[PDB]
Amino acid sequence: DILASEDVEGQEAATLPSEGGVRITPFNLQEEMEEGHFDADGNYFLNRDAQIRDSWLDNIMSAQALLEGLLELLLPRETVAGALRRLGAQPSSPQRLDRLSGLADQMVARGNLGVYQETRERLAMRLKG
Amino acid sequence: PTGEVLSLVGKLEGTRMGDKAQRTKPQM
Amino acid sequence: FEPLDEDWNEFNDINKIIIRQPIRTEYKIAFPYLYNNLPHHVHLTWYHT
Amino acid sequence: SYQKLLKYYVLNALKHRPPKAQKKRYLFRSFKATKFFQSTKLDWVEVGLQVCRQGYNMLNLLIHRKNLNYLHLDYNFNLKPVKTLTTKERKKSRFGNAFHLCREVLRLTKLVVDSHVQYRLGNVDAFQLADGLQYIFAHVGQLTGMYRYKYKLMRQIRMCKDLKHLIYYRFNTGPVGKGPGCGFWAAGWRVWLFFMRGITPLLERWLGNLLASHFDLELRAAVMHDILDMMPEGIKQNKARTILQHLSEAWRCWKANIPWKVPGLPTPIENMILRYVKAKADWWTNTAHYNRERIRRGATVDKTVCKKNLGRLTRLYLKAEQERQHNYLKDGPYITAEEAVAVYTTTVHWLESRRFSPIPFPPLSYKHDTKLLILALERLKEAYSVKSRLNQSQREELGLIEQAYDNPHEALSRIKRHLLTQRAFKEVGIEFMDLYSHLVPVYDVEPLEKITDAYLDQYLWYEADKRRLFPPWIKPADTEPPPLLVYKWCQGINNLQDVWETSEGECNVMLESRFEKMYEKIDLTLLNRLLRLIVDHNIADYMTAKNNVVINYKDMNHTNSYGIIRGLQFASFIVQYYGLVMDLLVLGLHRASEMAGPPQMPNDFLSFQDIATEAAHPIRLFCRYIDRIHIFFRFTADEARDLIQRYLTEHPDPNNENIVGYNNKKCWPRDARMRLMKHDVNLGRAVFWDIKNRLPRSVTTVQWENSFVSVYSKDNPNLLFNMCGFECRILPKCRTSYEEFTHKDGVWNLQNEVTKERTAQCFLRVDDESMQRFHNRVRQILMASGSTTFTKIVNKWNTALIGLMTYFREAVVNTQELLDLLVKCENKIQTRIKIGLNSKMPSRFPPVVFYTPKELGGLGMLSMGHVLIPQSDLRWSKQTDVGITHFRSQLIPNLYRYIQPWESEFIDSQRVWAEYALKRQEAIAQNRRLTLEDLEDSWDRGIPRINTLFQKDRHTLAYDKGWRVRTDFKQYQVLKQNPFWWTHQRHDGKLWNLNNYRTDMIQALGGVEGILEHTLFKGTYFPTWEGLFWEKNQIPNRRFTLWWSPTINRANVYVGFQVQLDLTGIFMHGKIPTLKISLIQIFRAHLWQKIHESIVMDLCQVFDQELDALEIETVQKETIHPRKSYKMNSSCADILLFASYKWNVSRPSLLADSKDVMDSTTTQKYWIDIQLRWGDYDSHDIERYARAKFLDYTTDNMSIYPSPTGVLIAIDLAYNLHSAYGNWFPGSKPLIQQAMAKIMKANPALYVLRERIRKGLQLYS
Amino acid sequence: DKSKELHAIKERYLFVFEWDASEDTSIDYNPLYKERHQVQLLGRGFIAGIDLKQQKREQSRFYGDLMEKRRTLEEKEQEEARLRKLRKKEAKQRWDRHWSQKKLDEMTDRDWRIFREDYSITTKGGKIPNPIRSWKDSSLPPHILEVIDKCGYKEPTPIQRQAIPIGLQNRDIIGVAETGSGKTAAFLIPLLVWITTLPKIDRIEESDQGPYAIILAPTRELAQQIEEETIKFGKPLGIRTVAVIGGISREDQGFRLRMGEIVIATPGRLIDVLENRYLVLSRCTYVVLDEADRMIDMGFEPDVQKILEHMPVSNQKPDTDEAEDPEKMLANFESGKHKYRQTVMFTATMPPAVERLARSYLRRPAVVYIGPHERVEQKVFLMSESEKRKKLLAILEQGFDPPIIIFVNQKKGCDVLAKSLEKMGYNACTLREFALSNLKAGAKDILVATDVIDIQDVSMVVNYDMAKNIEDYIHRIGRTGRAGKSGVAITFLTKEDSAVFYELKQAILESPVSSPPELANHPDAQHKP
């Protein structure tokens, strides 16, 4: 046998959860009927489906502009990563290396993968077509 | 004293079996 | 270590046994086949350098 | 620490095995060829920061992947919720333990990285750096909560703790004392690297798969696929609805043991059906035996599994019984003709030697038929007096029994007509009593046949007692309980002629055995031939043809043709007379004639004519309980040597192999049990072989594997026997140490009859079978459902404990394993109730909840253990017109001290019966009838009790002979278990007294006023306890919880967790729904606020009248907020008084304190606050509560009061207390005392509260 | 032993982060195995890690006799010469002493850093100068030393020891310490040195051009405390101090304003002065804000910013590194009148508003950080009564910082315990003024006493007998001092003390400077007595 929510004679609403750090019981048997259930004599039986057991929970610019900037920062027949190697060789030019890395990361973030092993001529053909 | 009923092994030295056992008087 | 009830016979008669010095565990360990009943998986130690 | 580290080293050395050959392994070489990875050279600290921030970003992405906006991850990887969760939010926050394990590993990693970041900023020296890395790897478990997430990690902590110890003291000699710092972090570093070596691939697999009866059913499905897939489509569309109907019918016919046969069936499909049934039958048999062997060893299981397994093994034993009866009907009689004629003429010679007169048929009127019929009907209604609700087939039985009461002569005529005429009988049903160790049958007989059989049982025992059919060595008797049988057996062992003198090589032999298959090997024709010598031939044919009837179990019918029906009424005679035929085969006619003596002067049990006929034979003590024989021999040297020679003639032993296989008592130590000398073992083998040769194996069989032989000689110091559930070791005084005389329980001091000096000592123990049966009863009590009340479980526990102790009175104290088992089962029974109260395990729980008697609202538990009542639980309080008075009133008394021993009761019984005989002899000669005046000094003293002499049913109970063996055989007729099978209250009286236990229980628990502080009695407004009564054996669980709510809902019971109810100020510790369902019903409809506003309005009506006597110019009722009645952090003033000109105020003092000295700080405004309290047992002192709340609310910047001079009045509703603390103006204190007295006596809102409490507790007066 | 070896023959022939004592092995009652007679290996082998001098002390001293018997007659001189060479190497090595037996000219930077570590002080900034070791070792002018000697400060507080050299190097100071540790003289003394070491031509002014020093306090009580202490420093030096506070009627404070070096004020009353022109801030070169976090928690921040707005900005430090260079700022402090301003702010916590006041007021400051039951380290040992004397001795043998106090419950105890200690070669006083002088002087090292005046802060209190109530216990351990070094209170607990266990447990659980499961988990500490 199981009791319904109508044979409780005097449930009320849940005004406030806590005050002063003390948790307030919401005066209704809704959460006890969600966790377990009652018999005819008023005992309690609890659900026991806790497989994972959760031991912490238990206790609580445009791309064309990018290509123009890269073709500006490259010499012919040179890769982008090789340009990083040369301009990083404190380096000789920190600011142009910073600009080259920034343009490379803005090209990587748009989905273009593998831009480091790319010569100047293939990027020029990409800007043309 | 957290509940915890203890075993009676070795906890009887001066306590006998017939002691503190009383009988009743005849009724009426 | 955790482990890996005998009756009185003619063989374990303590009236036949001379108790002179108490026998210890290192006697059983140094000589594993002289003082041991059921010596199953013992290993023979080094004797002397 | 040295020994544990050496243990780990030996384990790692022993578990070492060479690694398996494989291809060489390069993860980073395959990572390098991928264009998505680049290589560089970085500082260690920079990449250490990059790794931990990438891990923080990964965990942040894993948190906000599931849209969890309420969980915040700190930069030290601490995960916290931002608010109070709900049910679905706790469901959506269920991650694996690998998540929190990776969390704690990254926390450890960030600690390790930031320790060096603290160094390279110039803050600390490297001398301070190496200590900091040493503290981390030593105290991982204290700095991180990673130990809660992996338990095997507890190995890794303590090892790092043990390496913490050694180095420290090896560092701390010389000028170095104590203080922080060694700096040797490598030993703690290696262990956590080796830990990460194993934890890495599991976490990688978790991140990989995160970021990206049934076996028999499958076997039946495979068999049906193999059947149906072979047939073609026109037969597939037919046999799918053809095979499945009779496929279950064949299995049902196998289960009902019906031979399966159907015409029109081909032979290969029939063989396939037979293979299917055989495979399912083997599976079912192995499953049934496996489920029985699981629950035999004490493994817990659902009750329906036991209920199905009992029926499975019932059907299997029915199939075995139908097999063995068919084997008897096919193989013919197993007994030869010569053995039957031999035992027949042996019975003839024994009845001629005793001059026995046969029992006749009662012709017309024996003038005792009415008494025997009434006794038979009382034995039939003995079982039905247990419960008042019965079934319809039992209502028909009680109707037939009452018709036999109303017309007894017609009932006697029907009984005699069925005796003289009826030979065919109705079918007997069979059921099994579910003992966990041993299956036992219970039979169900037609009631009209049962009345006849019960009257036959009464008549046969009443004639057999008068004609002296049974010799006194046949046991049990009506006058002797089985412990008295053990004591008389020990006295018979002691009182022999020189039984301990072994100076010339004499020996003592104690054999105990059981007739194997005594009940199942009785031929009914042989039973009839042996029965016709003692009763009428029509009565013998009635007793014989009754056993040839069909036994039914619900689908199965089989006739009985071999073995007797043990569930009959008169079958208790069939057990006892036929065993006397065994007395003629084991003991011999000459020795039985010497023991029984002349018929004109029969000897007593274990007594003889003279000493010469006593010691003229080695067979000199004999006894038989229902199936167990107990024999005792005295041998000289030459007789024992010749008997060993006669044994070794036919059965030689060249290698001394009779030592292996000797049954020996393992419950005693080796100096106590039997020493296995070769002469004694050969003598015991010779004794058992000489006893076994006297019995034909077709008649009965004894076995060595169920027997026991104890030999006393020069080489054995002591004698042993198991009898009537008692393990007994007899040890001489002269073969042991000196006089010392230390008094111990479980020790029977044995003395001689003639010389009256101490000669031997008997040591008692409880055997293993009784303890296992008691543990079976404990497990049956632990099979109670969750809807079962606590009082029924406690009553079953008390029934089992009384049934254990009142039989094993003296022997429980001697054994220690039973004393441990009682305490262990008691803690299990208490834990069963503690879990039924709340699912969370409490820290403490009072015993006074359990051991309170049922009259005071408790459970009435019995105690076998060392339970202490702690201090500050025996203090109680009371309130009267002068104030509050407190009073102060230890171990719980146990059961074994309130029960008499056996030996002193036997001595007292002999003395009071001798005195009764002398007073009866003086009463007859003086023409005097004995009254209660001459027998009031020996009241309730003796076995049997003197109370049976003054019963109304003397002439009725004096005709009931043979009641003890019938009381033992009641277990084969009634389905319930039978405690106290060895006694009956109408015959032996009451053998114990349990009112002193309740008296000392009430006295030891601090008195009634000390108990009733736990019971919420002072909230019920009853002035006394004696005028009250409970609404009607059992108490419901809700009423029990609401009754014991002052002692359960305490701070020291469920530690830490506390909540507050919404509309009240009731604080719940833990959570209890069975108490919340009562607190909602009692405190419904804003009753807390109604009581508060009612007290405010009543006190305002008090301050409204008598206005000029206090110089009040204006009383004011403040605008009370509706949440003020239950908020307890802060409060506000309720009733304000304006002074006319000026008032003097005093220092803050109590309501009962009259020492008032007022100061010059005159104030005009005065304020009164009303506070209500719902307290518990440890915190209900309302005076210190009012003082603490006044000093809290008047000394904080959170409460608001218009005046600094006022009073706080506190009322405890759980105990109905009231007090006040604060400032007072003149004339106010006695007025407010009388006003609060009138309020607490006459508030209608408090009356509504108290009547709702009395309605919830169902307590009236 | 004998009953145990018969028991051995009879037995033969017939979460928890600690390890339990029942898991132990080698509990064997054998005379051969308890004294296992370890080797010393020809007087040449050594057990690793355990101290070599301590191993040479604990040896059997038998093989040395075999040496001095069997060495050659020249080899005794060879052994003596080798030991003299080893002692020469040890004397070259030690030339790493303690600072209490070293001088000032030989005290290296590592020794000054260990000296800063000993008194729990730490400094932010570049080139922090050397602190003061003693008054005989200080560098103050002798008249200021004479005034401090007349005031009664025998030993400097560490806030003085660090803030006085930084105060004399004209640097801005942030002192993190609480009230009652000696902060007041710690900012007053460099002010007094600067005022009393001006030339006579630089002190003469015909008009009143305001104070040389503004000392602002948030409360009237702290202002009166700094007032009284500034008066008792300034009257032997002839330096006038004016209190601009509340609670005193306006006529008295107004008449004191007409008279004209040091002004200690409250912020509302001071801004009512400065917005109405009763006192100018012309020659002001010294600003002190004590308890600025209390100024923020009460809300005086725009008022003190407007007090800054009255300051002439001609003496503000430049926002360069030259404000923390001790050479230039030391020579600027030696310039007398025309130096830049110096601001000292004492606080207890760090809110961002005190950080904004620091960025508004200070120019590269130096942060000097310093640091009964809640604040005294407490340790307990559970034992039987008979164990007390040997545990005390073991503790004493570890060494201590005299003086210490040992408390006992009865005066007879006092006398007899005291005797035993003097027997063990300890200097023990029993318990009038005479006793404390010796202790103070260093003569006596141990005071034995019952719960029954006035005594210096102690490093250690031992409750040889536990007090009968927690209030007496609290008073005892309070003797380690109101503040400064936590000190240690060690208590011997027996079963006779069970009625104070619960409160003792609370006292310690409420002590963040304390670590005790032996008491916390004890059956008698669970409920109020």
Side-chain angles (χ1 to χ4, degrees), chain D residues 87-155:
Chain D
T87 61
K88 189 179 288 293
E89 292 177 354
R90 289 178 181 90
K91 183 178 180 180
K92 292 182 181 180
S93 296
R94 186 177 294 275
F95 294 99
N97 289 318
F99 181 76
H100 300 289
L101 183 61
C102 180
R103 184 265 302 277
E104 297 294 328
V105 167
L106 290 176
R107 182 177 178 179
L108 180 64
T109 304
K110 189 178 182 293
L111 288 173
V112 169
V113 169
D114 289 333
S115 295
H116 289 285
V117 179
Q118 187 177 4
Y119 174 71
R120 292 186 69 185
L121 290 175
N123 296 113
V124 297
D125 197 359
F127 289 150
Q128 296 179 357
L129 177 60
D131 193 6
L133 293 175
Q134 192 269 330
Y135 186 80
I136 290 171
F137 293 105
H139 297 89
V140 171
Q142 294 184 358
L143 293 175
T144 60
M146 192 170 69
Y147 64 96
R148 293 180 183 176
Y149 295 150
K150 182 66 71 177
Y151 292 100
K152 191 174 181 179
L153 193 150
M154 290 296 173
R155 181 179 180 271

Side-chain angles (χ1 to χ4, degrees), chain D residues 255-275:
Chain D
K255 186 173 73 175
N257 202 357
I258 301 300
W260 180 255
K261 182 175 174 65
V262 55
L265 186 65
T267 53
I269 189 165
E270 183 179 2
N271 292 319
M272 191 67 203
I273 294 301
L274 289 174
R275 182 258 181 87

Side-chain angles (χ1 to χ4, degrees), chain D residues 381-582:
Chain D
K381 289 180 71 173
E382 183 180 2
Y384 290 100
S385 296
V386 176
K387 62 184 180 180
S388 66
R389 294 180 181 178
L390 300 174
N391 290 318
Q392 294 179 356
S393 66
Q394 295 178 355
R395 288 178 181 176
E396 180 68 27
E397 181 177 1
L398 269 71
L400 291 172
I401 289 169
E402 290 179 354
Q403 287 179 356
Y405 280 113
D406 289 331
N407 196 357
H409 293 87
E410 185 180 2
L412 292 171
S413 297
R414 289 185 291 113
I415 291 168
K416 292 181 181 179
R417 188 176 66 247
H418 291 171
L419 287 172
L420 293 173
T421 301
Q422 186 62 257
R423 296 293 184 269
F425 298 97
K426 298 293 184 182
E427 291 182 353
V428 173
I430 185 169
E431 292 85 3
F432 281 165
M433 186 182 290
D434 194 2
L435 291 174
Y436 290 162
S437 178
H438 189 195
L439 277 75
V440 51
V442 173
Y443 292 157
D444 194 1
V445 186
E446 182 69 26
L448 290 173
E449 299 175 357
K450 189 182 288 185
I451 296 169
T452 63
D453 291 332
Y455 180 75
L456 183 64
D457 199 10
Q458 293 297 110
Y459 181 73
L460 284 174
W461 282 99
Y462 181 73
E463 291 293 327
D465 187 76
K466 288 175 70 175
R467 299 292 180 89
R468 279 85 56 84
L469 178 60
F470 296 102
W473 59 82
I474 293 174
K475 294 294 183 182
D478 289 330
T479 61
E480 293 178 354
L484 182 61
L485 190 150
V486 173
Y487 184 75
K488 290 182 181 179
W489 185 255
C490 293
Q491 294 294 322
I493 291 170
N494 196 9
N495 290 319
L496 294 175
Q497 185 184 6
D498 293 331
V499 69
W500 300 106
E501 292 181 354
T502 60
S503 66
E504 293 180 353
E506 291 86 4
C507 294
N508 288 316
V509 175
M510 185 66 204
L511 175 62
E512 67 93 20
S513 178
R514 181 178 290 172
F515 288 161
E516 296 292 327
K517 293 189 286 185
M518 182 178 176
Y519 294 164
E520 291 86 4
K521 290 177 71 67
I522 297 170
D523 183 73
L524 297 177
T525 302
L526 186 67
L527 181 64
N528 196 0
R529 294 292 185 270
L530 270 66
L531 187 62
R532 285 176 182 176
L533 274 70
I534 57 171
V535 296
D536 194 1
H537 293 171
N538 289 318
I539 298 171
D541 289 331
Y542 182 81
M543 292 172 70
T544 303
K546 183 69 176 177
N547 289 318
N548 193 2
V549 79
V550 177
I551 301 169
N552 190 2
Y553 180 73
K554 292 182 180 179
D555 283 324
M556 296 177 70
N557 296 111
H558 71 279
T559 185
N560 194 1
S561 66
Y562 184 66
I564 63 169
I565 295 172
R566 65 186 68 185
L568 295 174
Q569 297 294 108
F570 60 93
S572 66
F573 183 74
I574 301 171
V575 178
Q576 295 297 320
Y577 179 73
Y578 182 75
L580 177 58
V581 185
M582 302 302 107

